[PDB]
């Protein structure tokens, strides 16, 4: 659940 260091909220 991480895309280019952006994690799910």
């Amino acid at each position, epitope marked *: *659940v*991480v*895309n*280019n*260091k952006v*994690a*799910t909220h």
Partner: antibody
Amino acid sequence: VQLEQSGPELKKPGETVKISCKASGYTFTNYGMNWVKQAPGKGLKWMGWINTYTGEPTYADDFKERFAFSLETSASAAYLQINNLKNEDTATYFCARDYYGSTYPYYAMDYWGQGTTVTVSS
Amino acid sequence: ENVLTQSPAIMSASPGEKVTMTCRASSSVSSSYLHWYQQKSGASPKLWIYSTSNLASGVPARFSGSGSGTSYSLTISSVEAEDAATYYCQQYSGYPYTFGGGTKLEIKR
């Protein structure tokens, strides 16, 4: 999963070089790609990274502005271009993928290319 | 940037020996964001220990890491011939990533 880089290069000062890093075994656009320099017989230096989803590069302050990260996402490839080559650019350059936990980024690098050696010389 | 200093630059150990090398940071690093790499002669670095004390896949159980704040360490419970390598620490605390200068582990025989 593997990162496969292009071969060694010899270039004159003032030339340019473009190094490829081809990714396999994962969805390319999910993981950031990092670039790391190792001058001969020296340690490791992080050059910055590129967001594989957006194309946005982030350059470490020692690597502005002769350095260019780009992508060809349709080829799952990341490229590093070094312009106006200097003797100091003689090094092995590694691409290295972002390492993420199941929940958050670790700001580590899990998979590494085999490295590309660039010699700058007259 | 957050400069990492590794000690000792060169370590020598006989196999079976328990050894510890250090990584000191200029400013506090989160234990989540302090990692270790092993690099051998003519090869790519491999992630070895991540987030202070977690072993990467395929890394032997004889390795461990601890630390907090500005002081971190990697320990080898029982040195083996295959551990001859250079070990680099790496941090994030905001950008840039920095690496320590490396500890070269020599095996005595």
